[PDB]
């Protein structure tokens, strides 16, 4: 205030400072572009490791003795002696071991150990998540900057939906949000092609066979009512803000905060740290 | 601009846990607080410069409060000021 | 914090910095800002209690500028002090 | 019916307020009844007026009436527009519409606004244009005017009305009034260069100037003189507004020239009119002369000057009403001639016009006026108007000059002399000549050789005429002429000292006469004149007491009539200070008898009133003090001053009960007691004690009490040896007041008095404080405790040092009572960090602990040392040995050293209870 | 669940060990990621240096705004809300001689620091006295030697009466290994020894003087006392460790002081300097 009230020397100096601030903002935009370039470069390196561990989890690939020895050394250094092998376990025959190819409920257990997401999991969701194979992440290069999330389900054996892969997208605002980071923009997701309503874990089902009392017609009814679930992660909040959605926009903003928290948790902890969260050591 | 927001809320809740206040009235209260501070500090500076001591001590503040506030208000402001100084001096 | 040490919620730091920028004296006794902050918080608490009284006079638990003005009206001595 | 009658019957007012406060369905019922009354314009007139009033008041305001509100709105539009509706009903509808626009529809209420717009454009309903004028007055906005498009549409309507010559003259009046409204709104946006607004302004002004050029060229025979006068008035008011407010580029100089010619012709026509008409003529001439003033820069032709001068002479002549008013009461003449009168008329506008001319035009006007007044000398009827025109010309602060100015000036001077001499000359013409001669001399202070003899002769002649003639108007006019003479030249130099004294005497006599029935503003004028006289009062040895005492008595008589008159009071201050500014030794003993008794008269007069506040009373107290101080008074004041002043001042202080009088009288009385001889004062020293006892008592405000302390200082200083029996009275009064008073400054002053008494004698003060009791407790218990409490907040190094010395005496005395007396102050905060309000503190106040007075004063002095500011060894009596081997700090350190030397018996015991931090402060102070 | 963990077949335990090895490999990849980020951040600090130096010159008054930058600042002001900078007619009537009597922006850096939430709480008035002479706050990344970032505080010896050091700098150091989350983790910090002109002007200590003919020792001796006190300039000379005292006393010292020190350093580095103008005017809040 009084700095403005000071003579025009101070005002002109502050005007020059604001011009330099705009120039610094341009430099900061180019800085953010370079950071995204390098981040994508190293995400290309991240992806092979995540895919390899997903193959191990699903049983599509087997470990190797050198990897097992290195993991033994790493566990011994970590002090997490729970993973250590015992002679009683060694007594198990190959036939007993091969009864399950992948780790039973690996992703389900990891998400259960996760602080917030586990709350969203119901029993039917837990059953469905057993068919979840991989979780993938990607960056949005075109248009608005952002990152995309992917899940892989063994749709061939999945009795709930035919979606082979489900992808979740996030968006950021056009310019640089203050403090030099990006602020969220609304998110979009896919729709699940449920095989039937009974298997639809996002829905509770009611079956009715009736003879109408008014028209005396004969009819069989299949009825639907949505319920909360881990797959409510999909069908995300529609739009950031629109005239017709305001009443919806309330819940959209609340669920946007919650879903962005969940997605940040995924991106930072789970996808980069899956082993410890499954075992619970990350707790 | 003056901001005593969180502390105004704390004082209000301590006085009335079930009562709240809107930010505009809070800014008006900040204006009142600033005016009180200005008058007290100005007259306390008057007393400090008047004496060769040339210092605004707690005595200067107490005298300024006694000169400014009415009888009961002055007495209670002095009481709480001395309370705070004694608590702080521990 | 100094405010916590004296039990005050208002920040003794802000009052001391206001005194410094005003430069009301060549030196300030350390107890002086504590005393001044305590007096300011006393008057703020008085005004807030009267504002609660006014909001209750308005059958509401939320204080608004109308309630603050009515509270100032309610207390004659503070009415003349604040004006 | 009951709804209307009850609302318009005390049932009438009860029902009206009940309606207004309802904002209820009950209002909707009575509101429905009133709306039906309004609709039936064929009957129920008075109830319709009442309904309109109530609706106007109601709209200012819970909205159940909304259903019936719109019905009455739609009815009210018709009620306003239908010209057959009654006048007052129409006005009610119109301003109700304006109020509704203000509250509900600040933006256009489309139905009403468009309907009135169309009605004005087509049918020309005058009430509609009046409604629009008030609408622009009240509810429109400049942004709405420019960008809302209302301004352009209105201006187009007005231009169409003015263009359609078939429009009636009254329609032209309405159109021009609305055009003034439009220009007022337009000029409000002085932030030109706004492209849309600037273009709108340019087009509007160009079209308006064209049309107003057309309108004036019109002639209307003799159809209606009043309407024609209003028409010209509003046109020229438009033109004056344009010429004044808008840029020179808009109002070009060629248009100025042609409008000037047309305005001169209009002056001719308006003067020829009169073959309330006169009032309309005066108004139209006011506006025409305003325009002429504004265009005065342009050239003027000889015939043009002749026309202007003759027209103004006809216009400016006093109406018989004004002449009768002035002749009946000279007070009105004094008020108007002095400029204090609020009325503004044609003559004032002529004054404005003449003052503004440039030098060549001004010179030509002066020549023309001199030539005309030469001929008009025989024609007395127009003479006063022409004299006033000459006065206005000469009042123009510019060099009147020209070729033949000398001869015309000789003729003018001779004419003025003849006007003065002639006995049959009418009163007002003589008064105007008297007031005009000073201007004539002033503007020709040069180029008029023998100016000094002529000034002497004219001043003497005018004063003689004022004295001999007994027409009070002439007396006041001559006083004002004298006032004008004073500014013109140094009368003493031109008159000489003897003649100057004679003129002072004569003016004093004139003031004495006219002052009999002067009005308050006339009193102010007389005070100014007397101020002028006083200045010439020679301070040289020629000074005579006759003039001085006459001036003093006049000053007091003039002001005494209206004491509450503040302006007269301040002018009396100025005159009185100019009087007292004289310095001559022997006569300052004559002033005691000369001026002082006049003051006593003022004091006695207020005595019946019990000396309630009066600006004159404050003035006299102030100047008594100023006189007492101004007198040499290096030695004792002459005893005569005491004999006069003491009794009136004693009564004033004993009886008065308001702050200002008590304060001023107290300071004056203190000075009198201080500077007078103690011997002569000694026998009446008792009376001062009665005064002091009265003031210290609570029957007066504390504003008086605090000033008592210095008064007691004076009493003890002058009468240190007679006071002793009276000390008990002073001490008991001051102590009883101190314990009861709570004002900070008052108790500080009273404690200063107690310190003064203790320094005078500590044992005596202790004894009185112990013996005297209030509320059946020893005063020391209350007095010492409150003293210590107050000392915590005393201010000033002087009072701090006095407190230190007094408490040192108390400590040394070491009586039992001073030991037993325990004081309140040692604090522990109340439990909890919660902020204690007054309501809270009523149950949870902070707590204090008590110690003997000696411990408390030791703690206080230690704290003060702290503030002003192995060494931690205990047994400080040994520290003194190690240490021993005018400011507060120095004196207090010396006090502590002496205490450690002497009072070890009690001081050591106190030291043991002392805390370690206090001991550290004591150690560091000992350095 | 320990029971479940025991329930896992030996083969699945081997698979989990392999997955943990993959996680370690991801950790090394994160190390390389952080190295690349540090290098490019250093590059962009070099890029920022010119603008920061220019605004510093503006703040100190060493440089005057040009009309082009003035117009750019004005049009930026028209954006959002900064009309405080719009020069009024009254100021244009002023002359540079009258305005230049005060050169630079008074207490620019002091105000910027005191507007910062966490850090301002540590600045006492005694510290603020030195901050009046602060005219620059610079960043330096310890590319050479141990990793870390260094903060630089600049003063004028001929002007300030406190110390003879024109530049006071603070240093922060990270461990050779990344944190668990992938972010950098901290190592013990260090600070410079302030070259106080005299102990009286020193702001981090309180002194006392006394002189006694002490009979207890038959010594006519003069004594001096120094006591460390709380002050923002304690931000330097950070704590260090001695094993035996480290285990008992300095455990809490590292728990408390290091957290606050690192928080203050990060807040400065990130929030303050990149938005120095907004922080000074408070718009960065």
Numbering used by the authors:
A (entry chain E): 83 to 365
B (entry chain C): 37 to 126
C (entry chain B): 17 to 99
D (entry chain A): 4 to 12, 16 to 67, 80 to 293, 302 to 895, 927 to 942, 963 to 1004
E (entry chain D): 81 to 365
Paper text:
The importin Kap114 transports H2A-H2B into the yeast nucleus, where RanGTP facilitates histone release. H2A and H2B contain disordered N- and C-terminal tails and central alpha helices that fold together into the globular H2A-H2B histone-fold domain, with very basic surfaces that bind DNA in the nucleosome. These same surfaces are shielded when H2A-H2B binds the Sc Nap1 dimer (Nap12), which is mostly localized to the yeast cytoplasm where it chaperones newly synthesized and folded H2A-H2B. The mode of H2A-H2B recognition by Kap114/IMP9 is well understood: the superhelical Kap114 wraps around the H2A-H2B histone-fold domain, occluding the histone’s DNA-binding surfaces and functioning as a histone chaperone. Here, biochemical and structural analyses show that Kap114, H2A-H2B, and a Nap1 dimer (Nap12) associate in the absence and presence of RanGTP to form equimolar complexes.
For comparison, we also performed cryo-EM analysis with a mixture of Kap114, Nap12, and excess H2A-H2B without RanGTP, which produced a heterogenous mixture of particles that included unliganded Nap12, the binary Kap114•H2A-H2B complex, and small populations of two different assemblies containing Kap114, Nap12, and H2A-H2B. Nap12•H2A-H2B•Kap114•RanGTP resembles one of the ternary complexes, the Nap12•H2A-H2B•Kap114 complex, except that no RanGTP is bound in the latter. In both complexes, H2A-H2B is sandwiched between the C-terminal HEAT repeats of Kap114 and one subunit of the Nap12. In both the quaternary Nap12•H2A-H2B•Kap114•RanGTP and ternary Nap12•H2A-H2B•Kap114 complexes, H2A-H2B interacts with the C-terminal HEAT repeats of Kap114 just like in other H2A-H2B-bound Kap114 structures, covering an extensive surface area of ∼1,600 Å2. The smaller (∼120 Å2) Kap114-Nap12 interface in Nap12•H2A-H2B•Kap114•RanGTP (and in Nap12•H2A-H2B•Kap114) involves the β-hairpin of one Nap12 subunit (residues E288, R290 and Q292) contacting the Kap114 h19loop and the h20b helix (left). The Nap12–histone interface involves acidic residues of the α4–6 helices of one Nap12 subunit contacting basic residues of the H2A αN and α1 helix (right). Consistent with their histone chaperone function, the Nap12 and Kap114 proteins in Nap12•H2A-H2B•Kap114 shield substantial portions (∼1,800 Å2) of the nucleosomal H3-H4 and DNA binding regions of H2A-H2B. For instance, although Nap12 in Nap12•H2A-H2B•Kap114 does not form <4 Å contacts with the DNA-binding region at the H2B α1 helix, it is <10 Å away, close enough to likely restrict access of other macromolecules to the histone. Furthermore, the ternary complex is dynamic and the Nap12•H2A-H2B•Kap114 structure represents only one configuration of an ensemble of possible conformations. A similar structural arrangement of the ternary Nap12•H2A-H2B•Kap114 complex suggests that it is the cytoplasmic import complex.
